[PDB]
Amino acid sequence: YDPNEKTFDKILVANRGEIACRVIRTCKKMGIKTVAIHSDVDASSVHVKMADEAVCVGPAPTSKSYLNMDAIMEAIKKTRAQAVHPGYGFLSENKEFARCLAAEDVVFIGPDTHAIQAMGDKIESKLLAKKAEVNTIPGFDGVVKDAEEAVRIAREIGYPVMIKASAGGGGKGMRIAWDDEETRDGFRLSSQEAASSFGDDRLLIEKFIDNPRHIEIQVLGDKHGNALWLNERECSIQRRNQKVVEEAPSIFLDAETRRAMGEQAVALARAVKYSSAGTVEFLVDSKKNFYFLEMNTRLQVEHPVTECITGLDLVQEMIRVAKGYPLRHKQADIRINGWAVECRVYAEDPYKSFGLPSIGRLSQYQEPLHLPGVRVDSGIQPGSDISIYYDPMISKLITYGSDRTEALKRMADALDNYVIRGVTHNIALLREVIINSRFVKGDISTKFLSDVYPDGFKGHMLTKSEKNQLLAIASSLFVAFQLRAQHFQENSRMPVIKPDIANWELSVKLHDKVHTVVASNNGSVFSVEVDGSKLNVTSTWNLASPLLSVSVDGTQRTVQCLSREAGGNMSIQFLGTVYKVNILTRLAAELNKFMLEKVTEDTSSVLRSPMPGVVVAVSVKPGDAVAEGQEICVIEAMKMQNSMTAGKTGTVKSVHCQAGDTVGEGDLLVELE
């Protein structure tokens, strides 16, 4: 960060989200004026406020706002933008975009067009890698065009076969087969889906390495040919072939393999004439054999984690390289300083398909920035709306420490002290992963989510001691609320006689079991008796703060009381997982034994439209059975869409709420059986 060094005066960020905030931060530190593009929806986003000035691009959709090169170029021309940073995604690898920039005067902060087109296509990337005398996955050179050719390739390369659609990415267009019949049917399905997804229709057979470790080498190149490999990183933890948990210092890999992979990456970068920052992904088998897989020609999403170990600012180096300065660092200077771990916080339900993109507006948002060794890359502020047009990103949480154990402990504490209210996040999945025995030991692969959780994510399985602690904390919170309810101010007309109850006898119904708890108070210390076990719970008992810290028998636990009702229901977050309990007094439970269960099947056979409007979406078809509270149709009125549902399991007799129908209020839409 040398102010004397005269780099570009103005930079335009051609991306949205946390990456825009990152670029704006490093530009403000390094001194460059920054102009930020934004759509109409994100007119109040974080990066707009962070930027010196902003220029709207247009409509909400990404294909029309950030993918519109003409709007980008007119924004550049109007504001006298000197440099541009595309971040990752959108026009990061756009050839015609960079052509227009080189046409007018505009410099591109990134690699040249030749490297972009060389590494864009997978087949030619593999061909160059073969020319680069680097280790590659076993496969047939060329594009498979017929099923017989595919099964023959399966013959020579072995039964483990993977079809990959050329170009594109994001865990799409890849099918795994093990048999010749599997080879051919995967081939025909891949050929069918390539046009729908990518349109290249070019298909590649490759050998599938068993339980690969997805290592990555960050590479920094300048215009003078100096290529540096900045350590490594591991991204084995994936779902839907997408990275979720990301470790900067690889634990499986050792110094010799690190040096070999770095040398190979530098050699290939020199072969491609890559004169910017990028990454090279490698797959390492059990026998420490690494095979090339793709080279990213953009700023990697998980760049920050290695920034914790190297101590370098990658974006600043990219800007300096774009200026033309030679690299100010040598191969010897870079070192592994500590340990760093990253978790990508998404707005998706981890209980369904390991993350289902959700939407909503954040009523509460607090990052755990006060905890030691915590960095939070986020483009989220309280009130931000999670839309369907954008990647459902929330943030990226990074912890650094002396060693792996300290970093994992700091990640656990940060995740426990992280407040998100308004959507469904995957914090529970992250915390449950980081405390797994296999992850701590280091025996991880690309199938960690699948093999560890074959049935899918189910939450934290709490043990007997943890169950006792949870019950004690819940009972103490209940008694604290009851005691706070008695602190009225003095009336002086009808004096209040505070009850002198000494012990509270409660029934707590966690999951399905019912536990008898006896609680007593002696000030700030609650003595709890759960099924024989005796515990002490102490805290400040601040009932209004979102985060409550309680010490139970010495062990310190941070919990959040998400929901509380007068009926006894309490939804409380413990160790990442949200548990539902029902605390009643003993007499209340004894009397509740008489209350009869209300069956909630309902009928809702004749369901009516809420308000008059056009039905945008129909989730049912005649002859299709529905469930209780199952979505029926989404109708817009005053361009406000409401998704009205059914009430009981019943086959649809007829859908009167077809798409485009302007059904009025209280009109028959779907008949149930």
Binding site: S44, S363, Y365, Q381, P382, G422, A544, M638, K639, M640
Partner: protein, 247 residues
Amino acid sequence: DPSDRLVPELDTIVPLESTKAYNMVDIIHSVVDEREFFEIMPNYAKNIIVGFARMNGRTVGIVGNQPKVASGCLDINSSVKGARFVRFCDAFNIPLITFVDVPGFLPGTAQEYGGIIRHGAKLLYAFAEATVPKVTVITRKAYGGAYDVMSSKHLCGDTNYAWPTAEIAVMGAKGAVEIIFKGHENVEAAQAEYIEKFANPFPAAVRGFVDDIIQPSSTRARICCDLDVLASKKVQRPWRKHANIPL
């Protein structure tokens, strides 16, 4: 729960265009202590919201317009739902907080034949007769006589605020244009000049009908301050056995 807690999530809860609706219960939850709200009649006449909450530990009654249901328009059921709640809050010394976003009264022949005038006058009377502290915040639209009904400053209201998205007017800018400039019959710039000086809270602010144009994130704190100042409010009214409410 601190009485000066900020609520930044309200800074953009109101959509900038006037066609989308929003949930005002979200604003109510954001403002009140511990986000705890006891709603009264939550399934009947859902275009108005009434309930009990606490501010700085003191019980408060809350009335608001729901732009989700019927676009926030007032009708018979909502008026009679709000009137008696306001009367009960007044009778037992409970401060009132009002959130105002109402385009007017629901039109139709059924409303006219049901006696919408009497039931609207019920709510107007209920707000006018209140002698307890009253705080009002306008989030967007306040059009026509509805603005008079929903706890105006002119009904002996104590403190009134307006969000930067507020709009106080006799009617919508469009119909006002066709009714004022009917003769000119050329509105291409007339509408532009009308909406540039009247389609904003300035006409109400410069006449002192609202005490301030506050930011949404500073709502709760402001209200708390008022509830600490207006606790000792006392007014005197002419003697009567009882008043003849339009029951």
